Amino acid sequence: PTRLSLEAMLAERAMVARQDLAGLKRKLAGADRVLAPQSPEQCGRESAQAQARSVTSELKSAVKEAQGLEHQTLDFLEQLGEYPVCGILHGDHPVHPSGTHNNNGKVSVKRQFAAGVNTSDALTCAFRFEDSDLVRETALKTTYTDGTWAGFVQRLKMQTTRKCVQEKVSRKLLKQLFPYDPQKLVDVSGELSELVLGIKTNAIASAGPPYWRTKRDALPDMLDCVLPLLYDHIVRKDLTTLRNKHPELFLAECKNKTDRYEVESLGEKTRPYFSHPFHLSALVSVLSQSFSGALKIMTEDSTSFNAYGFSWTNGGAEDLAIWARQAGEAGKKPPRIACYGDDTDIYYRKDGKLYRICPDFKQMDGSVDATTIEAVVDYVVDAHVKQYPTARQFWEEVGKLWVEMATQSPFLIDGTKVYRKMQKDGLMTGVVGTTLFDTVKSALAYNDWADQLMFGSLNLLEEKYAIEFFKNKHGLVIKEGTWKPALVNEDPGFGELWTEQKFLGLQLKVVRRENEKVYVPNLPFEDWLTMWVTPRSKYRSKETETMRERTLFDRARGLLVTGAVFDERARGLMGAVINSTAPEVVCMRVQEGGGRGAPPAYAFLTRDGVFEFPISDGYPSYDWVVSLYSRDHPCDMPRVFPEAATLIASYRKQVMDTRVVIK
Amino acid sequence: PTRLSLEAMLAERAMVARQDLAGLKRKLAGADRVLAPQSPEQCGRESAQAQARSVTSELKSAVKEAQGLEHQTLDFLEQLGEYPVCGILHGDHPVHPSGTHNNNGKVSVKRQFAAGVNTSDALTCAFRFEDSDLVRETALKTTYTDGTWAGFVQRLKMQTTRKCVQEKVSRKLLKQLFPYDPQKLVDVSGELSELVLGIKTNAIASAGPPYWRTKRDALPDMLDCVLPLLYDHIVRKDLTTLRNKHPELFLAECKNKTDRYEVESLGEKTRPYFSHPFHLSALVSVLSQSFSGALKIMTEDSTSFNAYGFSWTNGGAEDLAIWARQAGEAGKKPPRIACYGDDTDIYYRKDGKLYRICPDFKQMDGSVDATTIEAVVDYVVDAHVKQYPTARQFWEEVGKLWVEMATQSPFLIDGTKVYRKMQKDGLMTGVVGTTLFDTVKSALAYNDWADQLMFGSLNLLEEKYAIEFFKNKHGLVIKEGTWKPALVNEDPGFGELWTEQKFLGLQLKVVRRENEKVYVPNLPFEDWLTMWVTPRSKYRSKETETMRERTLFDRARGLLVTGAVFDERARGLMGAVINSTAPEVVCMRVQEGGGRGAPPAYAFLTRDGVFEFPISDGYPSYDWVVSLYSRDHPCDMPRVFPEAATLIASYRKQVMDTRVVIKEE
Ligand SMILES: Nc1ccn([C@@H]2O[C@H](COP(=O)(O)OP(=O)(O)O)[C@@H](O)[C@H]2O)c(=O)n1
Numbered sequence A: 001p002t003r004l005s006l007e008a009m010l011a012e013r014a015m016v017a018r019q020d021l022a023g024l025k026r027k028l029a030g031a032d033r034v035l036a037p038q039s040p041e042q043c044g045r046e047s048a049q050a051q052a053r054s055v056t057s058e059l060k061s062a063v064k065e066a067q068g069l070e071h072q073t074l075d076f077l078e079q080l081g082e083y084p085v086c087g088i089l090h091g092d093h094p095v096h097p098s099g100t101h102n103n104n105g106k107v108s109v110k111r112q113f114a115a116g117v118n119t120s121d122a123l124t125c126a127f128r129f130e131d132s133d134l135v136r137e138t139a140l141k142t143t144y145t146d147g148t149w150a151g152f153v154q155r156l157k158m159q160t161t162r163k164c165v166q167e168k169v170s171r172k173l174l175k176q177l178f179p180y181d182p183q184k185l186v187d188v189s190g191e192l193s194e195l196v197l198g199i200k201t202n203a204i205a206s207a208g209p210p211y212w213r214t215k216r217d218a219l220p221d222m223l224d225c226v227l228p229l230l231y232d233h234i235v236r237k238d239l240t241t242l243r244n245k246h247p248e249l250f251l252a253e254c255k256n257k258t259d260r261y262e263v264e265s266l267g268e269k270t271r272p273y274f275s276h277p278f279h280l281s282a283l284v285s286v287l288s289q290s291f292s293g294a295l296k297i298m299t300e301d302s303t304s305f306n307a308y309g310f311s312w313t314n315g316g317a318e319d320l321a322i323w324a325r326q327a328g329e330a331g332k333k334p335p336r337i338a339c340y341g342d343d344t345d346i347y348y349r350k351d352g353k354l355y356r357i358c359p360d361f362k363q364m365d366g367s368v369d370a371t372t373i374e375a376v377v378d379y380v381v382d383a384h385v386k387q388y389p390t391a392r393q394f395w396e397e398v399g400k401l402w403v404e405m406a407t408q409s410p411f412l413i414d415g416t417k418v419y420r421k422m423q424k425d426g427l428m429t430g431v432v433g434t435t436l437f438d439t440v441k442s443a444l445a446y447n448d449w450a451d452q453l454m455f456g457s458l459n460l461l462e463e464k465y466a467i468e469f470f471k472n473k474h475g476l477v478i479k480e481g482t483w484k485p486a487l488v489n490e491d492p493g494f495g496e497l498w499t500e501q502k503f504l505g506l507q508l509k510v511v512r513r514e515n516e517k518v519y520v521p522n523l524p525f526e527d528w529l530t531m532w533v534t535p536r537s538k539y540r541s542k543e544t545e546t547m548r549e550r551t552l553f554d555r556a557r558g559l560l561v562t563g564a565v566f567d568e569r570a571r572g573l574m575g576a577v578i579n580s581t582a583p584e585v586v587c588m589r590v591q592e593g594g595g596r597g598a599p600p601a602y603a604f605l606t607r608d609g610v611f612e613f614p615i616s617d618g619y620p621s622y623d624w625v626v627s628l629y630s631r632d633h634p635c636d637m638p639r640v641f642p643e644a645a646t647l648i649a650s651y652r653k654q655v656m657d658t659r660v661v662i663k
Numbered sequence B: 001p002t003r004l005s006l007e008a009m010l011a012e013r014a015m016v017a018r019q020d021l022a023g024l025k026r027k028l029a030g031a032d033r034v035l036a037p038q039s040p041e042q043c044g045r046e047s048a049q050a051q052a053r054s055v056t057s058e059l060k061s062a063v064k065e066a067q068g069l070e071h072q073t074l075d076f077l078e079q080l081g082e083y084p085v086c087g088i089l090h091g092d093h094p095v096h097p098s099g100t101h102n103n104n105g106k107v108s109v110k111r112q113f114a115a116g117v118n119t120s121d122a123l124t125c126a127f128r129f130e131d132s133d134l135v136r137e138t139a140l141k142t143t144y145t146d147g148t149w150a151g152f153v154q155r156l157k158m159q160t161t162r163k164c165v166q167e168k169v170s171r172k173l174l175k176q177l178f179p180y181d182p183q184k185l186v187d188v189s190g191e192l193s194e195l196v197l198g199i200k201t202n203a204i205a206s207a208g209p210p211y212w213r214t215k216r217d218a219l220p221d222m223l224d225c226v227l228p229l230l231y232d233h234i235v236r237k238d239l240t241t242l243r244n245k246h247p248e249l250f251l252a253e254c255k256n257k258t259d260r261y262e263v264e265s266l267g268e269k270t271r272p273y274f275s276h277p278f279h280l281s282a283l284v285s286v287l288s289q290s291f292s293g294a295l296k297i298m299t300e301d302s303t304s305f306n307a308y309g310f311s312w313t314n315g316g317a318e319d320l321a322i323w324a325r326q327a328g329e330a331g332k333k334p335p336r337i338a339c340y341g342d343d344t345d346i347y348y349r350k351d352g353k354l355y356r357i358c359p360d361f362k363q364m365d366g367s368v369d370a371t372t373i374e375a376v377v378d379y380v381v382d383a384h385v386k387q388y389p390t391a392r393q394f395w396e397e398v399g400k401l402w403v404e405m406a407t408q409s410p411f412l413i414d415g416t417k418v419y420r421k422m423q424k425d426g427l428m429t430g431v432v433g434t435t436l437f438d439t440v441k442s443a444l445a446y447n448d449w450a451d452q453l454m455f456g457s458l459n460l461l462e463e464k465y466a467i468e469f470f471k472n473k474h475g476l477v478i479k480e481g482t483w484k485p486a487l488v489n490e491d492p493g494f495g496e497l498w499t500e501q502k503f504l505g506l507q508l509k510v511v512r513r514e515n516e517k518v519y520v521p522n523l524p525f526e527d528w529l530t531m532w533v534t535p536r537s538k539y540r541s542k543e544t545e546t547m548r549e550r551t552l553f554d555r556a557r558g559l560l561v562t563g564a565v566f567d568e569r570a571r572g573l574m575g576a577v578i579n580s581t582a583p584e585v586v587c588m589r590v591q592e593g594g595g596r597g598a599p600p601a602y603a604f605l606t607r608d609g610v611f612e613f614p615i616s617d618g619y620p621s622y623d624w625v626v627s628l629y630s631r632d633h634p635c636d637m638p639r640v641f642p643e644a645a646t647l648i649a650s651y652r653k654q655v656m657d658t659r660v661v662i663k664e665e
């Protein structure tokens, strides 16, 4: 009665069974389970939940108090009046949706500073399986929050009013500092629709004005309607008329960044960023994503100061060490300098011994000068038009929009008043290319620093003079106490640190794989703990209990992979979270990671940023994680339930031989 | 902000959009629509539904009257007492689920003779777009129904108690009449699990006793638990113990077939068929489906009597005519005879003129003798063991089970009494291999018929003598009036028939593509209309209006492809239905046909039975359908809404050139 094969029927059956949680629960009941090493229970279920709730309650009160503080005026910004709501229609609807972001015909926004913090689930697990005092102390220092009005304005003022230093910079110099492979550059002489369709972005991010919807929601309006209109005014050299008639098409929104913040500085520090119109960001992203994909990193070309694109897995961690060891004596041979946005790793030798410095810039975007920004854009544009000269003029026009977006877009903050940064200097954080602008500004300053070493100014190795130098000569503010050269353990033993310092937020450690040294990332337990108990997620009451339980599992898998497996205490905690995850939650069909489970939040595991788990019901063993970082002696990801496939299929193959003798 | 490309974002958006009927309806609002040829509306919505309800009401009352008829006794069967409910456990549960098919510990069933018929939607369309009197009369003749107790027992008695003639048949004769390709036989000397996982069946069919669930539900119980138990007793030559301990494992169920039945004979005719245990049918299916996949058909080998596997598309229809024309003068050269189950196409020449016969066998399964059945099994088993001798003993044992299933399975009918056919003769309809057993029995009889022509008995060309011959010499009953030779139009012009007769339920017709003849299937309007107004589905209250409207759309496509597009009137009716289908229903994401829309009901378009529409939102135009039947590659299926995709995506590409000179230097 041919309709489908039994093989196919069995598969269909199994795919449907992973969606029946009641059935999974039954079928996995006595299943053999592989248990992670885990910390012992420290208190009972109710106590863990009460301790977490007490902490959350205190943080909520701290946020509410800080949110109640008056903020300073916005008088440090230029004020431009009000913008009319865009009236452009795309078929049956306006591109600016009716009855939203509209105050009597004028574009409007409202800043959200909510009282709610992150959820208690992760913190409950922490109290359940770790030291009460340490958990409590750790959890009280940081919280995931909207921040505050006062802190928002304070930080906005700092990065829009700082006195900058114009860099001395040319194509020739940027070529030396940021070599790239021209063959990897996108053919921007291709047709524009196709180029823009190739850029990647966050589907649920704001599309900005005039759309006031997510990017995936606003994507047809942008592509089908606004983009060709923008294109027509570009090529007719008539952007002025478009700007004047439809100012919302060039308007940005200045927003408070919801983030992990130190509780004690909530009233002084909330980070601003800018959200630009989708058509502008997507157009410019054609150049910016093409360039970043073509950039060499330091470990590939030792003349390069670029670490933007560096990642830890597949030898990456060890690549850093090998590259760094080539650092020479200060004043004689080149140091090793790695820039990624506002993060830097500096190596030099004094009397033969390797030293490492990992300084912080204070609010770096405030120090990014207009000359650097224009030179970066010129560098990126010229790289493409050198390789693809027939599209030179179009992309040079795009370059001008890019500079504008990075330095001078008008923006809303709260209500209808439109603002503009008083000076071209200062980078408008969140503009496309933010990372590259930061990276370049950092490298230019540090390249000059290295030049001064060779000039014989060795006192620039010392915090006092280094800080003065970066301030007076580059307008950069290095945080006092963060210029602290440390002796490098150049060939660490098993379990030993490279140094105690962080780069890209992680320490470098050596661990054992058989008799091989494997270089891996690492953190102190307290830092894993802070991340764990402050998930970047607000309390969603639409979230089922199953979803919450599955989130804990995925986040634990994520932290382990990021290197929490290499700290006993974090390993034991993530292990307890995983072991306490129900069989049906482990094995259910999940949506994130394309059915493979939510990828780790940490962004620099792989260069393309996309880490994917092999299976949604695997757990990160030490052996498996180690193999992710080695250049390789790989292995599969171990399943939590080795027999899950057949318990779920209700079928275990028995060999039945048709060739038997019966007689 | 890297997460996914705008291109992938677009695509994801558009897959979402096709599931949002409100949005599809709005976006397709004033879209350009390509219309199929249609018959014009003949009455309003309300008028159509009213007349449809009128007919439906009359059918239900006719069905209820026929179902109230007392049925004759089942004394004609052997009675075997009652069977104990199977207690075999598969892990955490019994393979025979608790509280089902269990009367005080004995296996039980209840026959369903429900009063409801098919739904009225399609009939409403018929009334909306066609002649009132003709639609009413057509729709009253036939109804989709469970049948009756009275008709069911009457047809069961006929099928189980007929005097059969034992065929004279050897492997040599079957090799002649049923050649096959030995290299196309599955390697049955491979591991059994893999063999069984390769057979194909209907996921929602009953798995039979002891499962009492659908085959997809019962599948792990069958595969993981019962099958190896069966295997083990087979190889230990110990089936007797298994049978005696667990008799539900060999029990069948005798069922009434829900089908299209003639109203006036409802009380005398309801087809029985048998539902065997899943482990049994699956095991035997390894041989049976391997063999049917290896068989040659008539048009591949002119010695072959076999049409089992013939299909109409891709030149099939013309292959039949090409094969048929080779028929020679009766008594001097061989006829052309094609058998498919109980369906037969016969050609011979008389004074050089080609003639065609298309007779009907009455209740053929009652005439299939045990000798024929054992010869077919032996033939199929031998075919495999000659090619794969290392598994000879296992499969000969399966062959014994197969014969038992085909002739002697004990079975339930209604309640707990277990029955069995008294004589071995008579085929238990629905057993795996039913079609082949039927095909071989018929072929053996027509082969003998042909020889008698060659021996000089030319009076066997006439119904009176033919009917007598098939009765007396083969135990087969040819329906009076259906043996009527017809002059074949050997090379029909455009729009002309081959003859008016049917084979596999369809006529053969020639139509024009450009200026070439293409051979196609065809029916008169009335036969299409009968099929249209009697869908093979019950009234389910679970079904939404969207689902019902879509079904109409899909069934109209199905009939067009089957050949209704080649009859102007039926074409017009299907087109009217298709054109009156709402844009959102036409364009929505559909689950059937793997997303391309429910395939046609008709089972012999392709040899594998599977036909797949290219797209779910296209319609079957004359040009597209005619290309399915010619050997030329099928042209595109035309979209109902050529701009649906760009309209749904809300995006139409514009070329924007990056190489423009913006400023003269
Ligand atoms: N009705 C439900 C309930 C839970 N879930 C699962 O809940 C999980 C969400 O938790 P997660 O750890 O992966 O990620 P986030 O919720 O932290 O973003 C997904 O894997 C979903 O498959 C679901 O998909 N549908």
Ligand SMILES: [Mg+2]
Residues within 6 Å of the ligand: A193, A223, A224, A225, A227, A228, B652, B653, B654
């Ligand atoms: Mg366009």
